[model samples]
Target chain A: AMESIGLVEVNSIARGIEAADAMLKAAQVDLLEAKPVCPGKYIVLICGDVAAVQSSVTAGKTMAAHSVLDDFILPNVHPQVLTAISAATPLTLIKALGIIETFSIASLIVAADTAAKTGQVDLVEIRIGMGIGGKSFVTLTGDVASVESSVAAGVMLASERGMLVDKVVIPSPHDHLKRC
Target chain B: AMESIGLVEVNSIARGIEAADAMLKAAQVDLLEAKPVCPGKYIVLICGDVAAVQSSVTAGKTMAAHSVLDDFILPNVHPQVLTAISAATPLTLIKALGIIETFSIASLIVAADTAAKTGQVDLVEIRIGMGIGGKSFVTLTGDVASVESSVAAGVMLASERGMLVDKVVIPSPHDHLKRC
Candidate 1:
C-alpha cells in the first residue's frame, strides 16, 4: 500500500471531507493526512498500491468537483520526497543549495519529486502550505551543478501552471543556513 | 501573568527566533509559543501583565525589524478568545455564526479579540494559520444582531491595514458544520 501516494486539495472543508470519504471508499488506500487548511481550504493525502492510489485520487477529485484545487497520484514516489514532506531532514553539512517556492502545495510536491529524480541531491525540506500564506516550498542540498540542474528541472513543471513563486541555487550556502 | 498577550510575527524564521529572544529579555513574560510557520515565516507569542506584554511585543517587533509581518498587544484579552486560539471549543448548540478572515495571523487574532470584547459571543475557533497559508480566521457563535455587530467591529480594525479578507454572519448554521 506504500508503492504510491495520492492527494486531493479542495477549496472547502465540507467538500474536502466528502472527497476524503469518496477516496477511501473507492479503493484500499491508507489515509496519511486529512485536515482543513487556512483560508478555507482542505486536503486529503493517501498512500497505497499504484493502481489503488490512482483510483483513490480520481474518486476524490471527482467528488470534489468544482471545489477541487489540485489532485495527484505519484507512482513510485521518491522516498526523500516523503521524508522531506513529513519533517525537515537533518544535515551534518550543506554544500550547494537549491530552493523552489510554489503557490500550490500539490505543485510544490511534484516539483520536489521531479528535482529529486533529476539530480543526486538531498532534500532539506518540503514545506506543504500549512502556513506561508498557503504557498509551498522545497529545499535541496547537493553540489553546485547538481543543485542548479535539479532546481531548473523542478521549476519548469510548476511554471507550467504559473504556480512558481521563485527558484534559486546557491553555489555555496552559509554555515548558519544549515540549521534550517 | 496572563493579564495580556503579545505577539510578533516575522517574515523570516531566523529573525523571528532572535525577536523571541529579545522579547524574553525585555520583559518578564511567559512564552506561549514560538516557532517557524509555513513558507519561511516565524511567530513569537507571549503573555504577561499589560505593561510587560506591551514591552515584549515592542522588543520582538524591534528585533524583527523589517522582518516583522504583524505585531499586537492585547491587554485583558477575553478568555474565550484565548480558548479559541489554543483549540476548537466544544459547542452543544450553535446559534447565529460569524466568521472573519484576515491576511495575517496577528491581524486575525486582533480582529477576534476585538469581536469577543464587543459581543457576548462564544469563540468557536481561532485558527492561527498553522495550516492556513499564514493567514488566519475566527468563528463566533452568538445572536444574529450581536454576531453582525461584532463582525463589523472586528473587520474595521483589520481593514485599516488592508488585511481583511472577508466577513460573514450566518443566521443559522447547519448541524454538520459543527464538526468543523
Candidate 2:
C-alpha cells in the first residue's frame, strides 16, 4: 500500500526540473512523472511514506518559488490510485463506474489519491496530461455506494483548487461504454 | 502537383466529423487529417486541385456553423509542406535549418504549405498539436537562402491569422543538432 502521493505543477520547465530534483533529494520517494505539458508547463509526481512525501512536497514548493502553479500532498494514498495512474486496470465485473475530471494533471492526480482512500474501489485508469491540453481524468469501478463515495472524495479535492472540470457516477453503465 | 490545401478546425468532435464528411462529398479532395485535439477540439485537412479544395473548405465551413473555430484554403501549396507534415525527407547535408511555430495545429499546417511553396527546401518534420497544448511547429533544412525564404513565407501566413508563436533560421546550424 502506497503511503502517500505528492505532486507539483510549475509554469516553467526549468523550474519544474529543479523542484523535482529537490523533492527527490529531500525524502526517500519514487518519482513517477517529470515532464512538460502544453503551453510550456511542467509537472512532477512522487510517492513515498506520508511524512517523507509531505517533506518532499514542501521542498519542491520552496524550490519552485514563484513558478509553482499548483502543489498537493495526500497522505495515506490509495493503492488503486497509483495503479490506475500507471496504467489501465482490467475489471471482469464493473458494478458501477466513477469519473473525475480536472483542468490540470496535478489536480487530477491528487483527486485520484483522495478517491481511492475514501472507498474500496478499483481504478480503471488515470489519463494524464498528454494530448488533453493539460487536463486529466480518472475512472474507477466498484459497488454503487463505493463508487459514489469515491467520486465525491475526488470531486471535493479537485473543487478545493478550482481545478474540477466534471464528474459522474453510473450505477449501471452499458457494457459498450466500458471502453471509455 | 498538389494544387491547394484546405483546413477546417471545429470546437467539437461531432461538428468536425460531420464537416469533414460534407467537405469530401462536396468536392474531390484527399483527406489528410481528421481528428480531435486537446480540450475537445477537432481539425481536418484536405488537398486537391485549387478549385476542388476551395469548394471542399467552403462546404466544411458551412456544415460546421457555430462549431467552426477556424478555417483556411491555401492555393498553390508547397510540396515540402506535405512531405514534412507527412514524415521526414532524406537529407545529405544540413546547410541551414528553419523553424516555424504557431498557436494552432491548423495554422501550422497552412504555414508549412506556404513555406514549402516559396522555397526549394526539404522538411524535417511537422510536430502537430500533441504535448504543446494546441500549438504546432515545423522544421526544415536546405541552403541558407532557401531556408530564409521558406521561413519568411511561413511567418507571413501564420502571422496573418495571429497564430505565429516563434520562428528561427540558422544559417549554419551545428551538425549534432540536426537530430533535433
Candidate 3:
C-alpha cells in the first residue's frame, strides 16, 4: 500500500488538534511539533505535489471525508510571479507563440487547436521563483528530436530584436537532466 | 604604301652615306636620315630593314652607287656607328616606343620578350619604368596570331616582376595588350 496524505480544516483549536491526532495515527507518522499562535486556530498537514501525494490524499479522504469546500483560499504568490507578469506584456515567449492558457472539458478541442499550427514546441510546466530586476527565468523543456532546431530558431528570433539571450545549454547525454 | 628595312655593313664613312643614299633612292623612301663618318675609312647607315629595303639596297650595290664613306686611315671605325650602339641600349620611352621609332627591330624584340607572361595588366606594366632601368617597346608589325599567347604571357610576367618598378603612377588602360 502506498503511503497516504491527510488534510484537515478546522474551525476550532480543540477540534483541529483532535483531527491532527487521528490523521497522524492513520498515516503512520510518529513526529509532532507544536507552535502557539495568539488567539489563534491553526492546523498542519503534509506532503508535496506528486503521484504519492495524490494517491495518499484520495485514500485518506475516504477515511475522514467531509463536505467539499465551496470556496478555496489560495496562498500568497511569490514576488517572482508578479515580476514575470510585469515583464511579460502579453508578449511572453509562450504568449508570442499565441497560446492562451485555459482549461476545457473537451479533450478533442485541445487536440484540434494544437494541431492547427505548423510548428509547435513541447512545453514544460512553469515554476515561480525570485525574479531578477522584475524578470524571472522561463524554463522550457522539449523532446530531444526537435530541440536543436527549435533552440536555433528561438535564438535567432530573440536576438533579432536586440533582446539579450544567454547561450543555449544542452543537457548531457549520459545524465538526461544534467545541463551539458 | 608600307616601307621595308634592311641591314648594311660599312668599310668607310663616304661609302656608308652613299649606301644610305642608294638604298633610299632605289626604295623611293618618303623620308630618310643617315649619319656617316671617316669617308673611305669607316661609316654608319640606317637603311630600312624591311623586305623593300633589302631589295633596294641590293639594287643600289649593283649600280655601284657613289660611296658616302670618307678616305680610310688605317681602317678607322665611324663615331656614328658607336652612337648607334649606345642609342640602341639606352632605352627611353620616347626612343623605344615613339611613333616613328616603333620600326626598330631590336627594340621590338626586347619589348616582346619582356612583357610576355600570363594575366598581363596595365597598372602592373606601368609600375616598370621605360628607360634607365627599363626596357624598349615592341611593335607587332606582322600577323600577331602566333605571338598572341606569347605576348600575353610576356606582359603578365613583366607586370608581376618588372624591373625598375615605381610606387606611384598608375598604368593607363591603353597599355593593356593581353589576349585570351
Candidate 4:
C-alpha cells in the first residue's frame, strides 16, 4: 500500500489524459482512476510514496496548465478508502454513516482517502460524476465517533481545495433511508 | 390518486433522512422516494392530498435546518409526471418524443411528474443524478400535441424553481436516439 495519494482535475478529457501521462512519467506512482466526467471534466488519481506522489502531482499540474480545475496530494490516505474506491463493499450492519461531497471526482477521491485514514471506518461506496452534474460523493460506515471524524477529515480536505459541497455523519440513519 | 406532490432537497444525507422521517410522520402521505444523490445531496418525495402534502413538507422543512437546499409542493400535479420519475417505461413504438432537462434531481422529478400528469404521454425514461452529474432528464412519447403539452408542463415546473437546463419536443425522434 502507498503512503500517499495524488489527484488531478482537468477541464477537458484531452488535458487530463496528457497530465496523467506526464505524472506517470515523472514518478513511480500507481494509477488509480483516469476518466472523463459529466459536463466535460476529467479526473486522474494515483498513489505512491509521499515524495513520489508529490512529484507526480506537481508534474501533472505543470502539464495541466490553464486547464487544471483542481488537484490534491495526500501524504497519508486510509487503506480502507483505497479498497472501497472502485468496489462497493458489502456491510452486514451499519452503526453509523458518514458522507463526503466534492465538486469534482478528483477532490472526492482525495477526500475519501483522507477520511478513511483519519478514523476507524469502512467505506460503503464512492460515486463518481456519472450524473449529479460533475460532482462526487463517498459513503462510509462505522461507530458514531469514527464516522464523525472520518467525515470531518474528508470535508476539510475537500474544502481546502474549494471542492467541498457538503458533508454529514448520521449517528443512526433510519431504516427506510437504507433504500438510498 | 394524489391531489398534490411534495419534494425536499437537503445538502446532506443525514439531514435528508431526518426530514423525510419527520415528513412521513406528520401527515398521511405516501413516500415516493427518499435517497442520497450526487455531490452529497438528499431528496425526499411524497404525494397526497394538497393539505396533507403541505403539512408533510412543512414538517420536513422544520427539521431540515440550514441543510435544506430546495423544496416544492405542487397541487394538482400532472399525472404522467409520476410514471416518469424512476422508471423508464418501455415502448414498442414512439410517434413523438419529449425531453426535459433540469439542474437537479428534485427539479427533474417534479418536472417529469408534471409532464406525465399533464397529457396522454407515455414516459420513455426518467434519468436522475446518475450519469449526468447532478443534472436530470426525462423522455416521453405520444402524439405531437400530447408530447408538446407534456414537455411544456415539465419545463414550466423546473423553470419556476430556477433548475431548468434544457428541453425539447421532437415530433419524430431519430431511431438512434430511442436506444437511450
Candidate 5:
C-alpha cells in the first residue's frame, strides 16, 4: 500500500486525538493508530493503504484547519470535559481565530535539524523548490515503498525556500514518552 | 489633574513592562508605577504627566515589538532577569527571533455581558471573533476620544478589517467578585 502524509501543526493534542478518532470511526479508512510524536510539536498518523491514507490526510488537514475551540482556556486538568471541547471545536474555526502560517520549504530544514539532533536512520534529504511557505514536511523513508506513497499524500499548504529530508527512524524504546 | 489612561497589548507583556521600566529609568519619562491589573490582560499605568505617559507608550511598543522570546508565552514575568536579556539581546537580534507579526493590537470590548459574567472588564465573547490563532493583542477602549486615539495608534497593524476595538460600558460596576 502506497501512502502519503502531511505534517501540520494543530493547536492541541486533544484536538488531534479527537480528529484521528473521528476519522477512524467515519470508516473512510482504517485506523492503524494515532499517537503524539512531540509535545505541542508533532504527531504520527498511521492509516490503511494509499487511497484510504489519502482520505485520512485530506480529512485530517480539513479537521485541523477548521478545528474549533473554546474561547477560554481551561485551567482544569480533567480529561473527560476537555475531550468534549476538543471534539466539538472545528479546525476551520481555529485557523480563523488567529494567524495560521504554513511554512513551506523552510520548515523542512527545521525538521531535518530536529531529525539530525535526535539521531534517525535511513534518512535522506531532498533539495527542491517543490512548493509554498518555503518548507517541506518529511516523507519516504520506510522499508516498503508503499509506505512512502501512503505518507506523501496532500495539498502543499506551505511554501518557503528549504529542503525536504527523509530519514528511516523507527520507534525507540523511550519514544512513547515523547507523545503529546 | 485630569487623566486619560488606557491598556495596551503588544505581542508580550514582559516586553511592554521592560519598555515601560526603561523609559522610566532613562529619564525619558517619569512613571509613578505601571502594574499588571490582570494576568497579561490589563496594566494600570500611572505617570506624572501626559507627556510622560505618551513617551512611555512609545518606548514600550518599540521594546515589545523587538523582544527575544523563545516561546509563545512566559514574557515579562521577571523584570530584573529580562532586563539582562534585554541588554544582551539587541533589537535586531530579538526581531529576528520573533516574526514581525509579534506586532499585535488587542482591541478588546469590555462589554456588560462579558464583564458581568467574567467579573472582569475584559472577557472573551462570541462577537469578538471566530477564534484565537491570529487575533490582535493590544486592548483599547473607553470613551469615543480614547477609542479613536487607541485605534489610530494601531493604524498600520489593523487587519484587513482595519481596526481593533475594546469597549467598556460605563453602567457596569466593574468587578465580578465584588459589587463595588
Candidate 6:
C-alpha cells in the first residue's frame, strides 16, 4: 500500500461518499483518509499497488463526475511523505528547514513527495488544511543547500499553476523549536 | 467547561503558540484544541466560565497582536454545538435538515451557536475547514419550521460579513442519510 497513493477531491459530499464507496469496491486498496473538508468538499484518499491505486481513483472520478475538483496519483510516493501527513517527524539535529505552502491540498502532497525525492531531507510535517481555509503546507529539515534544492522542486508544481503561496528556507533554525 | 467557549485565531504559528501559552496562564480554562490551521495560521480554543474564557481570549489576543485574524467567544453556548464539532450526531429519525455554509471558521462557529439557540434544532455537525480551503459548514435538523428559523439565524452572522456561501433546508431528508 505504501508504494502508491491516489486521491479524489469532490465538490459534493453526497457524491463524494458515493465515489468513496465505489472506489473501495473497485480495488484492493487501503483507505487512508476519506472525509469532508472545507468549502463543502469531500476527499477520498487510498493507497495500494500502482495499478490498483490508479484503477480505484479512476472509478472514484467516474462516480464523482462533474463534482471532481482535483485528484493526485503518485506511483512512487516516498514513505517519509506519508508519515509527515499524519504527524510531525522528530529531528535529532536542527539544521536548515524548508517550508512550502501551497493553495491546493493535492498539489501540496505531490510537492511533498517531490521534495523528499529531490533531497536528503527529513520531512517534518505535511499539514493538510483543517482551519486556515483550504491551503496546505509542508515542513522539511536538512542541510541548507539540500533544503534549498528540494523546496525549489516542490514549489515548481504548485507555482506553475499559480497555486504556490510561499516557500522559505530557514538556515540554522532555533534549537528550542526542535521536534520532528 | 461548556458554559462558555473562547477562540483565538492567529496568522503566525510561532506567535499562536505563544498566545496559547499565555492564554492558559491568564485564566483557569480547559484547552479544547490548539493547533495550526490552513494558510499558515494557528488557532487556540478553550472553555470555562464566561469570565475565565473571556480573560483567556483577551490574553491570547494581546499576545497575537497584529497576527489576530478572527476569533469567537460564545457565552452560554449550547451543549449540542460542542458535540457536533468533534463528531456527527446520529439521528434516529429523518427530519428537515438545514445546512449553513460560511467562508470563515470563526463566523461558522458563531453561526452554529446562533442556530442552536434560536430554534429547537439538533446540530448535526460543525465541520471547520480541513481540506476544502478555508470555508466552514454546519448541519442541523429539526421540524421544517424550526429548521427554517434556525438556519436564518445561523446565516445572519456570516451573511452580514459577506462570508455566507449557502443556507439550505431540506423539507424531508432521505432516510438513507439517517444519523444524528
Number of the predicted model whose TM-score against the real structure is largest: 4
lDDT of 5 by residue, B78-137 (tens): 222122212232222110000011112232221111111221122111111112222222
The iRMS of the candidates, in order, is 7.0, 8.6, 31.6, 3.9, 16.1, 6.4
Judging by lDDT, tell me the better candidate of 3 and 4.
4
Give the clash total for candidate 3.
33
Model 2 has an lDDT value of: 0.78
Query: Taking the tens digit of each residue's C-alpha lDDT, what string does model 3 give over B3-108?
Result: 2333343555556656656666775432223443222322223333355555655754644444422211111222222223333322212111101112222333
RMSD of each: 9.4, 7.8, 34.9, 4.8, 16.8, 9.5
Give one digit per residue, the lDDT tens place, for model 1 in A1-180: 347778898876546655776787778777767777665687888877999988989988887788788887788888788777767466536789899999877788789989989968998887775633778889998889999999999989789889999999988777778666
Q: In angstroms, how far off is B88's CA in candidate 3?
A: 16
User: Per-residue alpha-carbon lDDT of model 5 for A68-136, expressed as tens digits?
Assistant: 221111121222212221233122101101011223322443333233223122223233122222333
Candidate 1's displacement at residue B150, Å, is 1.7
What TM-score, computed on C-alpha atoms, does each candidate reach? 0.52, 0.52, 0.20, 0.71, 0.27, 0.53
Candidate 6: tens digits of C-alpha lDDT, residues B1-180: 457889898999999999999999998988877878667778888878999999999999999999999778988888777778756466535488788877777788889999999968888887665554566778888899998999998888788899886666767653323522
Worst 10 residues of 4 chain B by lDDT: B83-92
* TM-score per model (chain B): 0.83, 0.83, 0.32, 0.81, 0.31, 0.86
lDDT tens readout by residue for model 6, A68-136: 898889888998877777564654465798999988888888899999999599888877756546788
lDDT of 4 by residue, A23-83 (tens): 9999888887888876577888888899999999999999999999888776767766666
**lDDT (C-alpha, whole model) for all candidates:** 0.79, 0.78, 0.31, 0.78, 0.31, 0.81
Docking quality (DockQ) of candidate 3:
0.00
The clash count for each model shown is: 5, 2, 33, 21, 63, 15
DockQ for every prediction shown: 0.13, 0.13, 0.00, 0.32, 0.04, 0.14
Better of 1 and 3 by TM-score: 1
Q: Residue A103's C-alpha lDDT in candidate 3? A: 19
| Candidate that beats the other on DockQ, 2 or 4, i.e. the better one | 4
Q: How many Å off is the CA of A64 in candidate 5?
A: 7.3
